[model samples]
Every structure is written in structure tokens, then in C-alpha cells.
Target: TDFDSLSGTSTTWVNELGSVMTIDVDRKGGVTGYYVNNAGTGCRGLPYDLSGHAHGSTIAFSVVWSNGIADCRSATSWAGYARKTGVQIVTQWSLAFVGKIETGQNVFTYQ
Candidate 1:
């Protein structure tokens, strides 16, 4: 599948905390690169291994980041999914913590 439709920059608005997020993609090859801008008191840029498949009208992706450190925290693993909606996509994220998991949802619009 051609990833051209989803190959670009997008802005994500986190629903639960009213925070802003950003996503950037480099689709020059089959192995695409994804960068994320996370919102907090300070901004954070994290890299993840992105893999997905386009089924009909939706492009569903699995995101994984096991980089040990992120945003001043020792992040064991971070995972998420982005489901396409035309020029927009809705994303769900799961962050692992000491004793619990933090989950969030965001809506992304391509620019």
C-alpha cells in the first residue's frame, strides 16, 4: 500500500488533558520514520518504531518505543495506535509506569 496519504506532518490534540501533540513522518521508504512531540510542562520529542497496514479506508498502526529514557523518565515501554480518518486520525496511547498504566486519546489532523 502506498503510504502517501498518511505521509506528512500532523497535529494532535489530547482529549483528556487538553494538551497538544504533534506527529511527523518520513515516508521515503518502506520503513517509515515517526517522530512525536509530547505535551507537558516541557515538550518532548520521542522516536518510535512504527508499523501498520491500510485496510479499506483506515490506516491502523502500532507504535512502540522502548528507548529506556524519555522526557526525564525511565520509560520501559510506550505503545499506541493511530487510526486514520481521511486527513485526520485518532490516536490512543498507553504508557507504562511503576504500578499502573496511563492511557490517553488524541485526535490528529494532517497539515
Candidate 2:
């Protein structure tokens, strides 16, 4: 199945920390890419800008849904790009601690 089969969706950033960042997701779900608004002067024009910073830190997923359809998932895993971490419990301390904070969106195309 093509990953792009699920696309055209967006999500917001959550959990803001100095360096560590995290996003929220429902049970049995994930993300693909993340969006950040460059509002202020902090790291705006630098390569360290939030946009460029998320390049290598992005992750994607396509999982089977209850309806038996695949969905696209994107998220920013970079500490700098991520705004939150450990905001919610993923499963338990061991899994949660090892898990990265990420936000995701699911897209569906009308047949």
C-alpha cells in the first residue's frame, strides 16, 4: 500500500520545552510531517530555523484502522522543532519514556 494513499491533513504542536519536545496522539496512531509557524526573531533566518530543523527529525506511519483503511502519519521528532514531551501517557513508563512526542493527521480521499 502506498503511504501517500493517506495524505492532505494537518496537526498542531504541543508540549513546549527548552530542548525536548513532544506531540499528542490517540491510542494506536502516529504522524508523518509537522508544521511550525516562524513568528519571531529566534532562529528565523538561520539554518537552525524551525522549518529546516525538522527535516531530519520527521517521521511517518501508515497503519490499519478500525474501518480497515490505511492512513498517513507525519510528525516532527526534533527536540527543537517539537514543543512538548511527556505530556501524556503512551502506555507505561518504559514505553512512554522511550517514545518520542509526535502529532499526526489522517487524510481520506473521496472515491
Candidate 3:
């Protein structure tokens, strides 16, 4: 019942946008915080309902939030799969678009 190895902050590089994305996962596999620099948005010190499941070295989950506005992609939902190897985690994200199926991958370093 310990997810200690995957519990921490991680940073990933966004090559297309030339920015970085950060995510923090607590010991219980709950997403504590997240930030996206390209959108100039982030949330911290607030209650989050996001949860994840850890099986062996792999983690998969989804998260949703309200932004109070409409845009091409507000990222209302996110589905991701991440596999940990040593100090690096290779993650694949299935972006939730209105009517599209887009996916991307990134390598994250655990902190």
C-alpha cells in the first residue's frame, strides 16, 4: 500500500511549446497540484478530487476541473499512463478534446 517511489513532484518538457509542465502526486496517489506554463495557469493550496492508481511501476488515472470559460482546449479532463524507471518516468497522455483523439508522450524526472 505504499506508493512512495512515485510520490513526488515531476517536471516534463514540452518540446512543441518550449515550456514545462509540472505535476505533484501525493503518497496516496492523489494529484496534489499541477501547473502549465504555456497557459499561465496553475492551482495550489486547494482541494483536488483527482486520484490515481499505482500498479507495480505503472500509474494510470484521470482528472477533471472547471475553468469557467470556453476555449479550443481548456483541458477539462486528462487521461494518462506513466511508467517509472529509476529516476525517470515515461508518460503518455490522451488529451481530452471535444471531438478529437490526440496523444503525446513525455519523459519526466522525479524530484
Candidate 4:
């Protein structure tokens, strides 16, 4: 399966406030990475577990805000497609704040 190429030592995207999503994609299109959540004070801006899959030009992922150490108690799902050599990703994402949904448009671009 051919997925968007995010394979690099610095496959980091500049997102919104809760920014810096550095992702690593294997040959099988398995996405494994961490997100630098800015307002995740509960974990002191720690990188949360990011898992998703890339199917062709599309990518979808979720963030696990709660770890064993502490519970940020929030979750987010991002659904989008890659553009132009996978350097730009435009997503319509929603944040689940204890099940209260808030949606936004996120443009993720890498350096």
C-alpha cells in the first residue's frame, strides 16, 4: 500500500496552538509518532501518543491525552489528505473535551 511519505528524522509539521506533530510512517503505512500539545498542562506539554494510518493520499489519527502518569482527559481526531509531496496536510479536526466536540480547520505544513 502506498501512503503519504512522512518518513524522516524530522517529519514535523507546524500546526496550530497544539502544534508540532512529528510523525514516522513505516513501509506498511503505519503511523507512529508524538504531538507537542501546547496546552496540555496536565502532562506539562509532553508528547502524547499519536496513532493512525495512511491510506493512499488520506491520513487519519487520534491522540491519547491520558497516559499512565496523568490524565489530560481530552482526545482529538484529525482526518485529512496530503497535498504536494505530502508536505501539506489539511484537516477538519475535532477535539473531544470529555465528549464535548469542537471542530476546527487545521493546516499542517512542514519546513
Candidate 5:
């Protein structure tokens, strides 16, 4: 038998380049394969700030994966702005996953 409903743990990261937005992926379970949306230019970070300007903006995202049997997930976002407004204007995300290889009760953790 096979597990058709199997999906490995995955994470997303966002960034910007002068005036472009980009996103990346960090996955487990061998990352058998993957596909992305709005992945134009294959860059990182946001394209612009809330003011419609090319000034890195807050980047946020989440993650989800499995232990080859069960699933674990979490999400969060942060930013860094050129202006001091207690707000993250330039944001970047990164996710890392540890592949599981057994079927049993598992525990998920994130920080």
C-alpha cells in the first residue's frame, strides 16, 4: 500500500530585491518535489513597502510537515523598515524541516 495523502513538512521565506519580491522553500521528506505560485524572478523578500515604494516590507509566513506518518505545522512573520515606526519594513523568512521515516505518535516543535 501507499500513502496518497502524504505531504512532507514545508516552509516559506520571502524577500525583496531593489524593487522585486521573492519567496523560497525549505522542505523535508526528501522534498520529493515542489511547485510555487507568484514565484516570478525567483527572488526573495517583498517588492515594496506599504507606501508603494521599493523599500523592503514586513515578510511573514508559516510551515507544516510530517514525520512520515503524522503532520506538524507552525507560522510567523517579521519585518525591518528603514524608518523607525516600531514596524518591520524589511522582512525575510526561512524554514527548515527534518524528515521523518516512521509511523507513530510524534511531537512537533517550533521557535
Candidate 6:
């Protein structure tokens, strides 16, 4: 396959803002992970739940900042492509706050 297999893919990826995303992909492309919003001030420092899926070269995932004790009532999602080189994933992302969405770009590399 020309596309990199995401199965068993686990790593902590860093963005431009130094936010760390630890992720894992299962055999069926089901994704699960944690994200620490090191670059933000509004949300709790606690790790957020990550979930998503991957198919072929396309990968998509998100995190909702809600954990019973605290709820930022916000979520962020990333849609992008992955490359075998460095196991990199380059993405276009958006953080949804209520009805508003802030868009941006992100890139991840396997730790």
C-alpha cells in the first residue's frame, strides 16, 4: 500500500504552539488518545479525551474538553493527510466553541 498504515500508530505529536497530542490507532482505524492544551489559558491543564478514525491516507480526530469535574464545553477537531515519512500528519483544524469555530493548521510527527 502506498499509504502508511495507522494501525498500532502511537505517538505524541507537537504543533507549532507546543501542544502535545498523544494518540493511538486501532486495526479498524478507530482512534483514541489524549491532548494537553499547553498553549491555551482558558481550558484546564487536564488531558482531554481524543477520538476519531483513519482510512488510507486520510485521518481525522477530535477532543472534547469535558470530564465531569470540569467542562470547558468546547471541542476541537482535525482533518488531514498522513505521510509515511516521519509518520507525519498535516491537518486543518478548528476549535468549536458553542456555535463559533476558529480554524487553523496543524502538523504532527511521531515522537
Q: What stretches of model 6 exceed 4 Å from their correct place?
A: 1-4
Residue-wise lDDT of candidate 2 within 1-111, one digit each (tens)?
A: 121222333434322221211223332234433222233423221112122211222333221111213212222322222212422212111101123444433222211
lDDT top scorer: 6
Task: Show model 2 residue runs off by greater than 4 Å.
Answer: 1-6, 18-41, 44-111
Expressed as tens digits, the lDDT of each residue in 1-111 for candidate 6 is 212465877767887777888878887788898988877466656788899888888978998888665677788899988766657778999898868889999887667
1-111, model 1: which lDDT tens digit per residue?
223444553433233344333333445312233545454523256554455444333444444444455443323222333444544455566655445667666565444
Candidate 2 lands at a TM-score of: 0.19
Q: How many clashes in each structure? A: 0, 14, 0, 0, 13, 0
The per-prediction CA RMSD against the true structure, in angstroms, equals 5.9, 16.2, 5.9, 3.2, 18.2, 2.2
> Whose lDDT is higher: candidate 4's or candidate 5's?
4
Candidate 3 stretches with Cα past 4 Å from truth are: 1-3, 6-22, 37-51, 63-66, 69-86
lDDT for every model? 0.44, 0.25, 0.46, 0.75, 0.26, 0.79
After superposition, the stretches of candidate 5 with alpha carbons farther than 4 Å from their true spots are 1-59, 65-90, 99-111
Cα lDDT tens digits for candidate 3, 45-92:
333333455545565544453433323442433343344353544666
lDDT per residue for candidate 5 within 59-102, as digits (tens), equals 23332333333333422222332223321233443444344232
Summing lDDT over every window of 10 consecutive residues in candidate 2, give the lowest-scoring window.
88-97
Model 5, residue 30: C-alpha shift (Å): 32
lDDT, candidate 5, equals 0.26
Q: Looking at model 6, report the run of 10 residues with the lowest lDDT sum.
A: 1-10
Model 6 C-alpha RMSD vs. true structure (Å) is: 2.2
Between candidates 3 and 5, which one is better according to lDDT? 3
